Amino acid sequence: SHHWGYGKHNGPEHWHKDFPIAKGERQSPVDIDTHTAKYDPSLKPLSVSYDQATSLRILNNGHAFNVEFDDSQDKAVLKGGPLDGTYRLIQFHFHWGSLDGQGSEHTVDKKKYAAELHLVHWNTKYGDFGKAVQQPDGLAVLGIFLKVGSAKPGLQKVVDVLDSIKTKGKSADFTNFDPRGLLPESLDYWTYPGSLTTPPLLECVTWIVLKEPISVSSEQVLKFRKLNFNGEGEPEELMVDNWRPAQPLKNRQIKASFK
Numbered sequence: 001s002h003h004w005g006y007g008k009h010n011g012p013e014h015w016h017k018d019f020p021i022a023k024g025e026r027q028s029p030v031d032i033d034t035h036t037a038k039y040d041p042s043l044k045p046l047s048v049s050y051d052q053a054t055s056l057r058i059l060n061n062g063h064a065f066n067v068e069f070d071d072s073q074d075k076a077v078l079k080g081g082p083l084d085g086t087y088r089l090i091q092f093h094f095h096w097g098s099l100d101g102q103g104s105e106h107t108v109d110k111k112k113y114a115a116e117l118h119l120v121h122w123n124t125k126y127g128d129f130g131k132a133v134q135q136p137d138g139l140a141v142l143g144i145f146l147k148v149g150s151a152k153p154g155l156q157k158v159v160d161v162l163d164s165i166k167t168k169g170k171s172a173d174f175t176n177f178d179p180r181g182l183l184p185e186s187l188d189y190w191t192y193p194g195s196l197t198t199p200p201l202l203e204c205v206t207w208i209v210l211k212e213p214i215s216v217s218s219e220q221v222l223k224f225r226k227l228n229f230n231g232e233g234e235p236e237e238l239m240v241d242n243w244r245p246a247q248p249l250k251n252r253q254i255k256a257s258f259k
């Protein structure tokens, strides 16, 4: 069974032994060299359409927490930008650090942010998420950096439910949450072809990483750091540093949406 994680003994440097694609040609995350990234005039406008998003539940899966959506219809979709067709929002989650100076998976000129939000979408031409992850254009993940400063009001409902899903396998109702409250003002982005950043590390993701970080408060991120990787009644292992470091860019170019 799966026993990968983020510790010294089962962390990112070990993953390749059970998931050899860990050493593949389009792995994520990557460092975004802002000087080398080139503006691409072929990019169409990005369209984030979350008006009808229907959140359902929040789950601690022992690696992060997922806010899950009803993706049985096109209720919240991502389109445009580098994408051909329609990608349906299925969940969002975060990666974060033990300290404010680390936590993000993507880096920007080697800068690490305190955390990174991933809004995960699947290409509806493949019918279901499981089929989509087997395709090179199966997923689109919208990545948003978090820095510590002023509180993000739209994050607080998430923060306040975390006490109820402290340990692996716990879930709670999480209806009527509006993920639009997690976005920055600008939709300027970088994009490149990559992978899932956790096992199974499938090379099925078009990454769209927003240039503008959101600000969250220290109190908000401190509450992320009180979660547990372990299950109930097991010795406490704080859920911190659940990020994979940057991987080799290989034969890829990062494109910018903005001149």
Ligand SMILES: CC#CC[Se]c1ccc(S(N)(=O)=O)cc1
Residues within 6 Å of the ligand: 002, 003, 004, 005, 007, 009, 010, 011, 014, 015, 016, 017, 018, 019
């Ligand atoms: C804590 C612990 C441990 C040792 Se057991 C183990 C099993 C699978 C992996 S992998 N290749 O999936 O990361 C790593 C380690």
Ligand SMILES: CC#CC[Se]c1ccc(S(N)(=O)=O)cc1
Residues within 6 Å of the ligand: 118, 120, 133, 141, 195, 196, 197, 198, 199, 200, 202
């Ligand atoms: C098949 C499968 C699977 C695991 Se579900 C998963 C894992 C990682 C991401 S990430 N961190 O790349 O957005 C998104 C979704």
Ligand SMILES: [Zn+2]
Residues within 6 Å of the ligand: 093, 094, 095, 118, 197
């Ligand atoms: Zn992620």
